[PDB]
Amino acid sequence: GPSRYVLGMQELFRGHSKTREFLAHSAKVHSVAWSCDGRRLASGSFDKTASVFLLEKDRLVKENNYRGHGDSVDQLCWHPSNPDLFVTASGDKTIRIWDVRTTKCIATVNTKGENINICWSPDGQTIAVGNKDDVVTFIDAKTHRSKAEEQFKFEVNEISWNNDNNMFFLTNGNGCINILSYPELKPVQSINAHPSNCICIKFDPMGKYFATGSADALVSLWDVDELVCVRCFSRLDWPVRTLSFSHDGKMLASASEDHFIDIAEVETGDKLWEVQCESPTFTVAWHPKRPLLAFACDAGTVKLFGLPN
Amino acid sequence: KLTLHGLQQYYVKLKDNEKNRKLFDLLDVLEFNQVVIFVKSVQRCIALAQLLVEQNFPAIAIHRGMPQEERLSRYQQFKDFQRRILVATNLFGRGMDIERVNIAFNYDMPEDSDTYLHRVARAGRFGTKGLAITFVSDENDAKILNDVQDRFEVNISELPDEIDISSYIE
Amino acid sequence: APEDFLGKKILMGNEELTRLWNLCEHMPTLEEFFEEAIEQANEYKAVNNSNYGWRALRLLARRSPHFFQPTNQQFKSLPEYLENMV
Amino acid sequence: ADNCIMDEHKREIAEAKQNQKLGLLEALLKIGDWQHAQNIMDQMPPYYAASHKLIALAICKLIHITIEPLYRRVGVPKGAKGSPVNALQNKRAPKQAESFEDLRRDVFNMFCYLGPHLSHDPILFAKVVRIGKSFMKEFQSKEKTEVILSCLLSITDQVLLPSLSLMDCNACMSEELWGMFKTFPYQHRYRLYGQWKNETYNSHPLLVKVKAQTIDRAKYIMKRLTKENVKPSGRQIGKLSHSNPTILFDYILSQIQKYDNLITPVVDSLKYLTSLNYDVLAYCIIEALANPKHDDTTISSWLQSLASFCGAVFRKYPIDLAGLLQYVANQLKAGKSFDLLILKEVVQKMAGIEEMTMEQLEAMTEQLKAEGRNTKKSSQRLKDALLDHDLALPLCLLMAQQRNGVIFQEGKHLKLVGKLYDQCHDTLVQFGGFLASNLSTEDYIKRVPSIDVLCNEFHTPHDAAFFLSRPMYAVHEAVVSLHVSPQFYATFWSLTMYDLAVPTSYEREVNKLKERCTALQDKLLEEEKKQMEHVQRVLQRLKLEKDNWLNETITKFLQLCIFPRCIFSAIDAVYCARFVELVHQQSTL
Of D153, D154, D404, the CB nearest to C27: D404
| Cβ–Cβ under 8 Å, residues A132 and A116 | yes
| Cβ–Cβ under 8 Å, residues C20 and D330 | yes
Q: Does D319 touch chain A (CB under 8 A)?
A: no
Q: How far apart are CA D238 and CA D171, in angstroms?
A: 9
Rounded CA Rg of chain D: 32
Q: How far apart are CA D254 and CA D384, in angstroms?
A: 30
Q: Does D126 touch chain A (CB under 8 A)?
A: yes
The answer to whether D290 contacts C28, with C-beta atoms less than 8 Å apart, is no
Q: How far is CA C12 from CA A94, D386, D391, D520, in A?
A: 61, 21, 19, 50
The answer to whether D173 contacts A229, with C-beta atoms less than 8 Å apart, is yes
Query: Considering only CB atoms, which chain A residues are within 8 Å of D81?
Result: 224-225
The answer to whether B58 contacts D261, with C-beta atoms less than 8 Å apart, is no
Single-letter residue type at D29: L
Surface of D (59-88) touching A: CB under 8 A: 77-83
Q: How far apart are CA D259 and CA D529, in angstroms?
A: 54
Q: Does B57 touch chain D (CB under 8 A)?
A: yes
Q: Which residues of A222-260 are buried (b: 16+ CB within 10 A; e: fewer)?
A: bbbebbbbbbbbbbbeebbbbbbbbbebbbbbbbbebeb
Biggest distance spanned by C-alpha atoms of chain B: 42
| Cβ–Cβ under 8 Å, residues D96 and D69 | yes
Q: How far is CA D147 from CA A229, D70, D142, D414, D466, in A?
A: 31, 18, 9, 55, 48
Q: What stretch of H or E contains D534?
A: helix D515-540
Burial of D358 (0-12, 13-18, 19+ CB in 10 A): exposed
Angle (nearest 5°) at CA A151 between A146 and A157: 95
Residue of chain D with shortest Cα separation from C3: D151
Contact pairs from chain C to chain D, CB under 8 Å: 100
Number of structural domains found in chain B: 1
Angle (nearest 5°) at CA D473 between D469 and D475: 95
Q: Does D258 touch chain B (CB under 8 A)?
A: yes
D201-208 long-range CB contacts below 8 Å, 24 or more apart? D201/D165, D201/D247, D204/D47, D204/D115, D204/D116, D204/D162, D205/D12, D205/D13, D205/D15, D205/D16, D205/D17, D206/D16, D206/D116, D206/D166, D207/D116, D207/D162, D207/D165, D207/D166, D208/D16, D208/D17
| Cβ–Cβ under 8 Å, residues D272 and A216 | yes
Surface of D (486-545) touching A: CB under 8 A: none
Residue B110 belongs to what domain range?
A: 1-170
To one decimal, the resolution in angstroms is 3.5
Q: How far apart are CA D405 and CA A264, in angstroms?
A: 65
Q: What stretch of H or E contains A18?
A: strand A18-25
Single-letter residue type at D501: A
Of D194, D290, D330, the CB nearest to C23: D330
Q: How far apart are CA A139 and CA D571, in angstroms?
A: 69
Closest CA to D290 of D234, D334, D258: D334
Min Cα–Cα distance to chain D from A180, Å: 8
The dihedral region occupied by A154, where left means phi > 0, alpha psi between -120 and 50, and beta the remainder, is beta
Q: Does A195 touch chain D (CB under 8 A)?
A: yes
The answer to whether D286 contacts C28, with C-beta atoms less than 8 Å apart, is no
Which residues contact residue D276 at a Cβ distance below 8 angstroms, ignoring those fewer than 6 apart? D174, D175, D177, D178, D181, D245
The answer to whether D559 contacts C68, with C-beta atoms less than 8 Å apart, is yes
Q: How far apart are CA A62 and CA A19, in angstroms?
A: 18
Q: How far apart are CA D169 and CA D186, in angstroms?
A: 25
Q: How far apart are CA B104 and CA B34, in angstroms?
A: 9
The answer to whether C24 contacts D287, with C-beta atoms less than 8 Å apart, is no
Query: Considering only CB atoms, which chain D residues are within 8 Å of C65?
Result: 552, 555-556, 559
Q: How far apart are CA A172 and CA A198, in angstroms?
A: 6
Min Cα–Cα distance to chain D from B103, Å: 13
Residue of chain A with shortest Cα separation from D72: A226
Query: Considering only CB atoms, which chain C residues are within 8 Å of D334?
Result: 20, 23
Chain A: list its partners (3+ Cβ pairs within 8 Å): D
Are B and C neighbours with ≥3 CB pairs closer than 8 A?
Answer: no
The answer to whether B33 contacts D229, with C-beta atoms less than 8 Å apart, is no
Q: Does A192 touch chain D (CB under 8 A)?
A: yes
Min Cα–Cα distance to chain D from B146, Å: 33
Closest CA to B168 of B29, B5, B1: B5
Q: How far apart are CA D370 and CA D319, in angstroms?
A: 27
Q: Does D558 touch chain A (CB under 8 A)?
A: no
Beta-sheet strand order (sheet of A261-265) = A240-245, A251-256, A261-265, A274-275
